[PDB]
Design a binder for this molecule. Structure first.
Ligand SMILES: Cc1cn([C@H]2C[C@H](OP(=O)(O)O)[C@@H](COP(=O)(O)O)O2)c(=O)[nH]c1=O
Ligand SMILES: [Ca+2]
Length: 129
């Protein structure tokens, strides 16, 4: 897997963001995670977490997996990095997301994220409190 550049266009919520990728606007859905919707508990905290992480990064990168790159709604499916740090993993580690939507072929970082979730659960963080 490799990292490609992109720039923030607009925050959306805990697990979606609007980025410019190869010069085109595109909504990205974070692979392998599920944040609560804004209207649910920890939803606002998830949204703020991602918003802040992505907007403070001076460099955003997009990392596609091996499988599908677009979902059925036209969203890009990727791991997103903020100055070298993976947002997908950071959400889980803080208990602001659950590992989820694990499909074969787009699951490279699965174990890495389950490791993060196991530690978040261990600490009773946010969703696991
Ligand atoms: C994360 C992810 C979601 N999806 C689809 C499955 C879900 O379908 P349904 O809409 O039929 O429930 C939806 C969940 O995303 P959200 O959590 O953004 O709603 O997005 C994929 O197809 N692949 C993925 O990798
Ligand atoms: Ca969600």
């Amino acid at each position: 897997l490799h990292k490609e550049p992109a720039t923030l266009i607009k925050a959306i919520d805990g697990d979606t963001t609007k980025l410019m990728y190869k010069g085109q606007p595109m909504t990205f859905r974070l692979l392998l995670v599920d944040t609560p919707e804004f209207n649910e508990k920890y939803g606002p905290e998830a949204s703020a977490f991602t918003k802040k992480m992505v907007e403070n990064a001076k460099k955003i990168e997009v990392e596609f997996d091996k499988g599908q790159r677009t979902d059925k709604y036209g969203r890009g499916l990727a791991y997103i990095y903020a100055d070298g740090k993976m947002v997908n993993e950071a959400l889980v580690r803080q208990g602001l997301a659950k590992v989820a939507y694990v499909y074969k072929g787009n699951n490279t970082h699965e174990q890495l994220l389950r490791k993060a979730e196991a530690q978040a659960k261990k600490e009773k963080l946010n969703i696991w409190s």
